[PDB]
Design a protein around this ligand. Structure first.
Ligand code: ZN
Ligand code: ZN
Ligand code: ZN
Ligand code: ZN
Ligand code: ZN
Ligand code: ZN
Ligand code: ZN
Lengths: 284, 284, 284, 284, 284, 284, 284
């Protein structure tokens, strides 16, 4: 607690420090305190509160180019996972979405294995204010174009880097550069299609413990995410690209007899998706 | 245990967890606590309370679009049945309504059975806050039309799906599509009229245990429901409707020499009825 | 007693039920308990008491339109008769009121019997919470319309329906429609005049047992009642009012040479009287 | 005027009167002011505010039996009429109710005149707080006696005493003692039936100016009222009664081949009607 | 003036006096202040507030036998007159009570003059807490002796000493020792009878300004008072007495073939009446 | 037995009645028991105690206008007499006050007899809660006037109705209207003077047994009483006053050569005296 | 000052001193605080409060023989003078006692001065806890020795040491040994007699500044005192006694033809008097 000590000594108010130590007032707390709050903790003299408040002003606003407020407000950021109750209708909605969108796939269970259902172990709400405001800023930006319509879907995403995503967000700098539609982030309408990627491309090496791509023991993890598509460009054939086509905010690969068996969605900017629900499950 | 631990760890206040463990403070409890409540449980330093409260703010108001608050208030919802006592005047009023509205019906007791009175076993008040809020919102909306009058009646409802109704409410998506007035929810001011639908359409197969439509042994259930009729369209003949006629909120089927023997009330939106009492009885 | 179990189960607090069973906490008790009371019975964690109190709020106030608080709280209603001992000065005031207001009537005791004294067997104070509240609300109304004066009297009432009066209160819907002043409830300042109505209008058949209108053997009952007269209209001859005359709250039939031998007081609203004392007696 | 001066002089604070004169503070305003309001007007010393507040307390709470509060709170009571705009939804719904309920009557318009529709000139909402409180208190009583249902209807009322009703409310002491159902206040769901009574019983002598019962020149006034019916007694033939039948709160006369041509509703205490709208019109 | 200073200096807290001078804190204000109120005015240290509170306790309670709290707390006592509004229901009821009770008396207006009506100039409510509590204490006594019935009436009183009455209350030590029923305080239910005494016994010499008993110019004053009668002793002929008859709380003299023309009420205890309304008027 | 039975039945707690029967809990006892006392007698469940305490509240405070508390608590009231021992200093001081105040009266012992000393048989302290609280309330009233001084004396009183006094208190409605100073209660400094009135005015007929005014055999009784004099009016000549003179609370008739031989004190309100000692004695 | 620091340091709680310094907790304050007060000022730990409370117990109770509590309680003791308002009846009753008791003296107004009435400048209630407690303890003793009667009067006292008395109380160690009845403290029932001693025995030399015994300019002072007379000895001629006569508690000197013109009262213990009022006045 030395920043507060230096700040209070510079003002000639060191005799107040015994209050600040008992109330556990740090500088990041002090910068948010007005006359009312300072009067609560026991700074009874108007002159002292005036000096403290104007010092906080001269620090936070007077040196805005140094951004001292950002250095003070690191505490409290970060992700939390709120667990859903299976008795709630939100859990049952997410589970119905998982279960009802299973499809048989062209491979003999090479990537996602063989199964018709999931054993759903838990579903978690992902909360992170910084990532959330990034996503909503981009959503407002996309809907300012595209006639006030974001065109927002809920889609499945799978990859071995779920933990990194839920803390640092989606990032196009890690993009699936070899995909059918180039270097973007891929999303599926069917949960079983995303299930094929939770260990890597084409199922990867299988589960770490048993090295099996059809393991019925190890827990899997999927993300069920908000995705802003905006004006979406329809495609049927394979077409590599680094960014969206001009005037469009995403790519929709549609089912075709000689092409995609199932719908695919690709965004090329990381802040156009938010990982709202984390699902832990097993195949059966 | 996990969500509150994460929330507190992100703020740097892990040393407070043993308090939150002994006071059984979960995150849903914490989001409702201010300085006074935090002081009660032993958070004595002002800075710690300030940090907790502003973290709660950043979770609730800062991410309102994720609706974490709804994720945390799942518990406490649901229905409770408060059993009325036969010595109360409310029980006696409901039973008087049941007994005094018995009538002769055209069939020889084929659908409802042959009886003159009921043996009332119990009457229960149905309490569910979300359903009540739904009903009262629709009621305000209807009375804003129809010159500030909701035209609210208490009517009998019979169906083999009373459990679903008391736990999830009236739902027009199950509506009696083959009924005389179309796909609506039907109510009657004669208890014996509604008794004809308890085991199914036109009496069903009778009770499950005996398959008897005039069983004097097995228990039956009726609902006594608040119904907002608003502006009601008077109809004197069978008329298949999918919704209310324009300008109206419900349909009243009136008795006629060549038509209905008794009054019928049909609504086409589920939120216009609320089941206030659940009556269990036998015919005698 | 299952509503408490459902309520506690909805909150997720069923592990506390073993306490609630031992303390006999029913839901109508629980809706009256706060932090201190819940701490008394062994709910030590703050989170548990918080959840219980918030659930009680969401029930009692969140659904006030359903009036669940009145379905609970029905117990304790009803009238109790507190017995007055002959050694108390209250008993003696009431007994002296009875004895000293006896008069000789025009009839040879045909309606009430031949006597000059009573044998008072007991006097009871009638206590009924809801009837008292109804009475005091009406008295407040009358005194506001008067010049802050309720014009309250203590008057005698005789009827073969006193047992119904002390449990349900006075009721103009049973009013003496053939009375000299019409469909009102009648009171007198003489006990021997109200004694004429104990067994019926004009004496009836006398006691049920001996069928004697002057039975000196078996018991009779009068009421001594607080009557709110407000602004009283003076009358000297029969007039069959259905209600009290415009601008007035009651009627006073004054004695006349060619009219009433004794004064009478009439009210046309049951709530303006409260039956304070119940007197059991024999004539001598 | 002098009441505030006396009140302040008794406290020894007459040096403050110059403030109370400039801010137009009267005793009725002062009995509602606390420390905050007294600070606003310039009572700066804490001791002065303490003295004023304690004097107000000694007046209002200390002498509650004299009801000085009611003496001071007289101003502001009374009726206001709020005009509806013909372009409003409410005006149009009330007008639809007026027009669609016209019926042909047995007499050749002898009582009401010959017409098929109305020319509506005004519709006004009637606002009076004392009358509204009276109505809602009675409504709570009735609904508590009728399984939580008031059975509230919107009905037309016609009388040559509309002004007195809108300023004083409905009053059974003026009741139509000669009506088919005794001394009650009568309401109808047909506007024309109530229109038959605007100039008096059977139309009286017609309009004041022309003495014509079918005048098309001069305006008529109907009330549209909230009526609490509670448990309504179903009656099919005339019978004079002074109050409601036992166990009931009103009487409904049903149409019959040899009886009523149209429905009648009769209440016998005036506190269960409230005159919500005042409709001014001509017949055409 | 100096009391607060001596009290504060005795405690060794003279350095606080400046605050007490800014806030106009006198000793009679200080004795009513706790920790909260002392915090408001700026006594921030717990020790100082503790010293002040303990000093006040040692003064008010420690020397309770000296009654210092009564030497303090004399300010705010005394009467105020609240003017009634002629548009008010209370004013109209009091005026109707006064007008409707005018009677023709035996003398040709010798005492009260010749008149049929009054011009009511103003009616005032008399408010005084000391007198009110005196009266209500006596009312409780009398009701406890009269089977819980005070037998409270509103009656007229006239005398040249109205101003002394409204400030010091009714006093039997000023009683009309030569009156018809002895040394009591006399009241009437006819305003005209009271009107005979306002200028003195039999009218005295009349108005001071014109010395005319039938003056139509000068203002008269009557008191319209609550009077507790309790068990009232009826008399039909005159007899002097100093106190009530044993067992009785008042005397009511009633007309007879050789007695009063009009009713009369006499109380022998000063505190059995309260002068609630002061009426200023002229005869016409 | 029955009030408590009905009370417990209305609450639905009849199964507890057996306990109430063993512990002799009547309703008047029950209204004074809290959680502690109820837990003592074996009401172990918190819910039962809560119901009982809320019922007692709903009876005692909820119907306070009926004053049930006063009906219940009549037991225990009344006077008791406590004998003083001849060996005590209190006995000896009262006897010294008796003996030292014998004086030579003008009459040759016609009224009180011929004697110089008394034989004291017993002295009794009179204890009555109700009369004591009446006296102390009046004493406080009188000392609020008269500069905080009650002016309390101990004086003798003699009368044939001492038994009535010690049970019902002094009563000015039984006053000595024919005395030298009007209709009041008379007290003497000299016991020999009070001795003149123990058998009536002028000694009456003497002892009933022997009809002798100077009997040395029969027991007499005097009262030694507290008398609040307040501000005492000094008088030297007879004056038949009904009440105290204005501004005074007693009359002191002082000795004069042509007037009183010995001093007299007169009060005109019965609650300004209290009979502290009853002295049984013989003259010698 | 420094005692709190040593006390806290001995307990090992010196780290708490910064709280005690800020809250101004001295040792005399600390000895009165418990768990509640200590938790209010911020001693949150139970151990710290326990140690402080047991240290206080060891100091105050353990060393009770040294009376440290009396050393700490030296603060707050003293005399305060509360000014009586000239409008209150207390002031006026004291003033009328002053004025109504002026008498002519045997001498020609030599010792006191030539006057007929007084001009009162101030009346002050004297409030001193220790003196009042001494007075009441002695009063209790006297009453217990005098059949429970203290024989308390209100009497005048004149002296040139009034300030000494109001700060120290009456003291027989300064007694008027030359008085008619010995070494006592002298009180009078006439103010004009105590007026003779305001400037010393026999009037001394008059006012200090004029040396005039009848100086109409210089302020004088009297005391109006509570005097416990107990059993007062009756004497008619001078007797130089040093103490109260055996068996008595005071002396009364009676007027006589050849002796005293006015009565006097004499006590021989300073603790039987209390100077309740201090009167500042001029003669006229
Ligand atoms: Zn595996
Ligand atoms: Zn069956
Ligand atoms: Zn019989
Ligand atoms: Zn016309
Ligand atoms: Zn004149
Ligand atoms: Zn004898
Ligand atoms: Zn001088």
């Amino acid at each position: 607690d030395f920043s507060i000590t230096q700040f209070v000594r510079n003002l000639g108010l060191e005799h107040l420090m015994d209050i600040f130590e008992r109330e556990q007032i740090t500088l990041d707390v002090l910068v948010e305190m007005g006359h009312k709050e300072l009067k609560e903790i026991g700074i009874n003299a108007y002159g002292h509160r005036h000096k403290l408040i104007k010092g906080v002003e001269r620090l936070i606003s007077g040196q805005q180019g140094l951004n001292p407020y950002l250095t003070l407000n690191t505490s409290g950021s970060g992700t939390i996972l709120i667990d859903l109750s299976p008795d709630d209708k939100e859990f049952q909605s997410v589970e119905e979405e998982m279960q009802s969108t299973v499809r048989e796939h062209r491979d003999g269970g090479h990537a996602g294995g063989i199964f018709n259902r999931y054993n759903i172990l838990k579903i978690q709400k992902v909360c992170n204010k910084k990532l959330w405001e990034r996503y909503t800023h981009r959503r407002k930006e996309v809907s300012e174009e595209n006639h006030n319509h974001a065109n927002e879907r809920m889609l499945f995403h799978g990859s071995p880097f779920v933990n990194a995503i839920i803390h640092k967000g989606f990032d196009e700098r890690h993009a699936y550069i070899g995909g059918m539609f180039g270097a973007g982030i891929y999303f599926a309408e069917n949960s079983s299609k995303s299930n094929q990627y939770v260990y890597g491309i084409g199922g990867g090496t299988g589960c770490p413990v048993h090295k099996d791509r059809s393991c019925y023991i190890c827990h899997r993890q999927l993300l069920f995410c908000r995705v802003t598509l905006g004006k979406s460009f329809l495609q049927f054939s394979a077409m590599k690209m680094a960014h969206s086509p001009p005037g469009h905010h995403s790519v929709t690969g549609r089912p075709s007899v000689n092409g995609l068996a199932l719908a695919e969605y690709v965004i090329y900017r990381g802040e156009q998706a938010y990982p709202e629900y984390l699902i832990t499950y097993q195949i059966m």
